[PDB]
Design a protein around this ligand. Structure first.
Ligand SMILES: NC(=O)c1ccc[n+]([C@@H]2O[C@H](COP(=O)([O-])OP(=O)(O)OC[C@H]3O[C@@H](n4cnc5c(N)ncnc54)[C@H](OP(=O)(O)O)[C@@H]3O)[C@@H](O)[C@H]2O)c1
Ligand SMILES: NC(=O)c1ccc[n+]([C@@H]2O[C@H](COP(=O)([O-])OP(=O)(O)OC[C@H]3O[C@@H](n4cnc5c(N)ncnc54)[C@H](OP(=O)(O)O)[C@@H]3O)[C@@H](O)[C@H]2O)c1
Ligand SMILES: NC(=O)c1ccc[n+]([C@@H]2O[C@H](COP(=O)([O-])OP(=O)(O)OC[C@H]3O[C@@H](n4cnc5c(N)ncnc54)[C@H](OP(=O)(O)O)[C@@H]3O)[C@@H](O)[C@H]2O)c1
Ligand SMILES: NCCc1ccc(O)cc1
Ligand SMILES: NCCc1ccc(O)cc1
Lengths: 245, 255, 257, 246
């Protein structure tokens, strides 16, 4: 019973107002965690917390563009204050997406994706390291993507930033193991989110369907539990078999 | 949340369930509400296990089977079908065999043994279980592979090769049987505590060598493999198929 | 040292299994083209004698004997004959001979399984064991296994075939690490679909051909010399720091999405 | 014919960071097979000495000073190469890179921005600028120099390895999107190689030694030859077995 619980744990989830992030918030709360989340949109963030606070859920938030270093430093300080410098769980879920042929990418496109997909997760880990160490039971989960192992038209820079994230998972896993912190990455296939609302792909999925947000969030919760205590440095695809055909 | 993280009402077969990882898997599955069938080659051991599991009112049945034998695998599948009335939700291929020798030392008998017990047993049991898994409407196959199928550990050549074969077979199974709502995945453990016996002396120098290469600096416990096997069989793993997941404390990526 | 030395197989000896057609025949000719003395085999005496007669008329140094590499006694014999011809020194072992059965998983019999394991995996494993003294005595050894790119993806009908080739990919890593001390390197080449006599029935099957070719970014199947060139390169002194790798020769097939 | 497939006669090539280490070996390897090479470096003095060395050995090497971490210098570099080679480039070798060895905690914003610019955005933007001449050559070959540590965790390598992992993924996207233009793209992932950039690591190499620059340059040249015509999208480690040694 204790191996499969997150009771007494504190968690930060970037980009919890919609999509996968929102499902991760609810899954973690469902298992006993206290969650701090963020978004760039005050109104929806605000709405999201009212809902959760109606429902018994200890969720806290503030507006953060995790594409801003200054903002990131800001988020980390507030998180540290709320949780008194102890954090069990960091989920780097917030990201960005640009779909263009390689010829079409601009300098702004490139810096945009690198900042929100790679530099964001990296610096937040740096910022959260003291608090994760203080937890004595740290878990970092990055939301990667399955296209970091295959070539999908238009995904070049986006997949490259996600492939950098997968490697960073390895380095975090080994460097911070001595602080009892585990790091893993979840690589989703196509998931129905507000991000993706914005036949060819599904024809390539053996299950013949796109993913649901809870099919990703459930593994995010699992990787944070005591039952996952020997799983670290892994990249796990949640794609209905999409990458292997 | 409660429906997607439960195995209530499911049926499972776990090969080699008397000790170690296999034993932890059986009890993890029962813990989440499955009815479990298990086997072993040692009858005496198996009976004791069976007699015990009752008294903690766990729903576990079993029979003696050497999974390296084709005819014994067939008889196992028929008894499992009879016990579960032709409906199997879960197949855990955990039984295997280990021999460690320099490449030059392996004989024809070694090669035959390792391939039969590690690769053919899992392949043939998948074929035999396919009708039951399909009749269940929601199937989950988990192979217990090994993280040494991605790196070279001294003495592991044929053993690791059979596990690399299992990892590939996982992908073929995931794609071919998805249409039957069957998922197939592989768990690749690293160094896991070996259950002791009254008569075998464990090589502690070999154990220390592998544990020294784990970032975590410790050996894994059987429950740390069993937990992921149960999760992979839950409704909550519905979009996870064809994967090989290392449970090794960072062993394979530790440079 | 020099570029000309590092890109040459002058003075080497090599064994290529299954050299009478397809990829194996292209490898025999590629290795001869760079100066190697080659030994080869197949199961068919008439075809092998014909190849050997052609290679003499080309003044290529190729020797051969009949060998079914799925048989343990035949492999032992082959290794004794090779060691006699090359005076116990072998620079290069190319495990090219293989076999193929295409069925749904439910369809495979015990004989199908045994056939594929013996010719794709046990043949290579045992021939590496038998060749080890000669590879070490050459002072510079190179083992190349011909695997398959479908040991990383699921192709319908390929379950046992791909699994035996995945076993080869792992064995490559063990051989690379255990025998580095003997100055032997081991690598695997993993082709996508290649035009060979082995695939001729596939190529005639126009629906099966378009299905596979639609998945290759290059829009075509490969040719035997596109595999053989890399087999030759992996055996040269220029490949001195390349060991334990699995290299796909597949026109982008496996990473295409 | 064999002799035709194993050869780079008449090809044109750009190799970034050709004044030392692997890049220097790649320049000489490519010239050795008949290529005409354009290369570059941030250091004018050493670029001069290299160009003068190669001039005195009658190699066809041209060079200009360029910092590939700067967007504008990349565009200037691309236009000079198009002019020298009359708009046709057979070969692009993205070798120039940077290294910063620190624990994850120590990396600064400049360090991160530094490594991404020189290891990732450098190659990516240069690929776009080189695309018309590579297409115009009718036979294009892009080779990135990545690193074998993009598959394992080596202490101090966290950001460096991540940029090389991004390179490895970018190779796959390039290989698939530009196969239609008869351009192939592959990555070489060296282990420890004896260079000016460079017992704990050697004890983990099965061969028990670091590599030589020509042991990387050999493969770079092979991947540009017609013999490599069906090889694209691959990441090939040149590491003496280091990544697989357990
Ligand atoms: N859905 C898929 O198919 C798929 C596949 C592979 C990977 N992924 C990855 O999964 C993660 C989530 O995607 P999703 O599809 O669930 O996205 P989504 O539905 O678009 O939700 C994104 C969430 O992130 C927040 N967010 C976005 N940018 C942010 C920023 N710069 N700072 C702070 N918060 C930010 C968004 O709110 P604001 O805009 O209000 O800030 C929103 O709450 C991403 O890393 C994505 O790359 C998704
Ligand atoms: N072609 C492809 O598309 C493809 C793709 C991936 C991998 N591969 C692999 O590449 C290798 C060569 O294939 P291929 O297409 O070139 O085959 P192929 O055209 O059929 O030629 C095979 C050669 O091997 C010989 N051979 C077969 N079995 C043998 C045995 N048991 N003992 C001795 N010799 C034997 C054959 O001659 P006899 O029959 O007369 O013995 C023939 O010389 C195989 O390992 C194959 O699995 C091929
Ligand atoms: N050697 C290894 O152990 C190893 C291992 C893995 C990967 N690698 C990779 O292999 C590649 C070469 O490494 P190396 O060790 O040969 O490095 P190196 O010896 O330090 O050589 C670097 C070369 O690149 C040039 N260069 C560096 N930054 C540049 C810039 N911004 N613009 C233009 N030129 C630049 C250098 O000249 P200036 O300073 O004059 O610009 C020099 O010519 C790098 O990508 C490295 O990441 C090397
Ligand atoms: N009993 C198998 C030996 C083994 C040890 C450690 C490891 O990571 C994988 C295999
Ligand atoms: N040699 C088996 C034939 C084959 C192999 C691989 C592939 O992708 C397609 C066909």
């Amino acid at each position: 019973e204790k191996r499969w619980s997150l009771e007494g744990t504190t968690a930060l989830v970037t980009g919890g107002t919609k999509g996968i992030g929102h499902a991760i918030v609810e899954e973690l709360v469902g298992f006993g965690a206290r969650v701090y989340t963020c978004s760039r949109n005050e109104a929806e963030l605000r709405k999201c917390l009212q809902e959760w606070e109606n429902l018994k859920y200890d969720v806290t938030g503030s507006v953060c563009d995790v594409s801003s270093r200054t903002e990131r430093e800001k988020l980390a300080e507030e998180v540290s204050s709320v949780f008194n410098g102890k954090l069990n769980i960091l989920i780097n879920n917030a990201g960005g997406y640009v779909n263009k042929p390689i010829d079409g990418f601009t300098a702004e496109d490139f810096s945009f994706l690198v900042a929100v997909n790679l530099e964001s997760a990296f610096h937040l880990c740096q910022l959260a390291h003291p608090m994760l160490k203080a937890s004595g039971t740290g878990s970092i989960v990055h939301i990667s993507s399955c296209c970091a192992q295959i070539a999908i038209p238009g995904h070049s820079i986006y997949s490259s930033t996600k492939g950098a994230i997968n490697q960073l998972t390895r380095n975090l896993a080994c460097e911070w193991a001595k602080d009892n912190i585990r790091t893993n990455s979840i690589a989703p296939g196509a998931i129905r989110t507000p991000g993706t609302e914005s036949d060819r792909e599904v024809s390539r999925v053996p299950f013949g369907r796109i993913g649901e947000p809870e099919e990703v969030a459930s593994l995010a919760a699992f990787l944070c539990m005591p039952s996952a205590s020997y799983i670290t440095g892994q990249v796990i695809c949640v794609d209905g078999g999409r990458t292997i055909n």
